[PDB]
Amino acid sequence: NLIFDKLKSDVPQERASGANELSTTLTSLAREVSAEQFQRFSNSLNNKIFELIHGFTSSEKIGGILAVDTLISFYLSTEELPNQTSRLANYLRVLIPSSDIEVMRLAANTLGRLTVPGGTLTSDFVEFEVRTCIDWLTLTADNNSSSSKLEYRRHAALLIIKALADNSPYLLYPYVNSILDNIWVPLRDAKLIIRLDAAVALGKCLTIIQDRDPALGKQWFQRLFQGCTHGLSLNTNDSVHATLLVFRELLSLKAPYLRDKYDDIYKSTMKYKEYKFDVIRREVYAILPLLAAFDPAIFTKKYLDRIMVHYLRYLKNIDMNAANNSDKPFILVSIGDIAFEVGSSISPYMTLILDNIREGLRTKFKVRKQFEKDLFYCIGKLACALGPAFAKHLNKDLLNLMLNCPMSDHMQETLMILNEKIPSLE
């Protein structure tokens, strides 16, 4: 009945499901003799779970994956571990296509876990998912036949790619240029999920390459930039932010990344109007620290002022239709992130930021509070970046308003962070 309730357990009852999983593991470990009653009971329960899954309502299906997580990674079994590998792999391969979102991660991480559970069949299975992934990713511009796989199969394929990457980098090490070739051309998709998890898989592949240190890695470090430029030349709505999604992960520079992206952002500041930039604004604010990680022109003093110019329309309203501000928390997130990455980029100009802080903190509504929930964290990053020189600015009219507010964990955390940073006001 515990596992039955795990199947008929609602999505806010995940803690109860985990507690029941721990109880099931404890009851299984309570057995002290060698027998097969528990094995046959588990097999019959798995069979009835597979019969009673409901993929249309996304219910009574995560119980099977919970049973998989119970039957794996719980004990160094010489019988329970290697005999169930193929069975659970077949179960997950059945469950992958006939399931909706929020289940692909929970199906792929278990497959990655059972790639190396102590058994004897790893490489053949891994090559099987590699073949499935490349078959799914084989897409042609003319006579489109893999367009139906773009609904759910590609995201699941990239999640399995991540599982192989973080569970066995050696097996996926030959499959690197294949992934680059299979993601460069069909990078544009229907939704953001495939692009995002493709970028995450590319970052995992970059980590694998860095750990392996292969001979002549420039053939990868320049070809990725060439593919980025090819995607940027397509200058469509998807391709504007797809290139930034690819550029999300980088650690070494040998190409004009510090030249081909500033003008890209300055030409793609807004989409259509000043409010339809929702998809790309978060990516831009995330890659601005990535752009600042190499050269904000601190000594040249030619890009810090351009960064300052970039924020003027964000200092005020962002729409002429209803006079709203949807990106005003994200914009402070961006300035705090670039402060924490490079303090010297904003150490020239902060009095305008303090004026914006005072304007925001003059009055507080629910919207002001939900937008100031990260303001304190950004201010703490900026204060840590400025260091002991942040003395005249911390004078008055700021900490009194900061304490004139309902208490939050972020509030106490940022107060103690600035306390340990500057030993001026304790």
UniProtKB/Swiss-Prot annotation:
It is found in: Cell membrane; Vacuole membrane. Signal peptide: none annotated. It comes from the Eukaryota. Transmembrane segments: none annotated. Belongs to the PI3/PI4-kinase family. The target of rapamycin complex 1 (TORC1) is composed of at least KOG1, LST8, TCO89 and either TOR1 (TORC1-A) or TOR2 (TORC1-B). TORC1 binds to and is inhibited by FKBP-rapamycin. Interacts with PIB2; following activation of PIB2 by glutamine. The target of rapamycin complex 2 (TORC2) is composed of at least AVO1, AVO2, BIT61, LST8, TOR2 and TSC11. TORC2 forms a homodimer. Contrary to TORC1, TORC2 does not bind to and is not sensitive to FKBP-rapamycin. Interacts with SLM1 and SLM2. Phosphatidylinositol 3-kinase homolog, component of both TORC1 and TORC2. TORC1 regulates multiple cellular processes to control cell growth in response to environmental signals. Nutrient limitation and environmental stress signals cause inactivation of TORC1. Active TORC1 positively controls ribosome biogenesis via control of rRNA, ribosomal protein and tRNA gene expression, and rRNA processing. This is Serine/threonine-protein kinase TOR2. It comes from Saccharomyces cerevisiae (strain ATCC 204508 / S288c). The chain holds residues 87 to 512 of 2474 of the full protein.
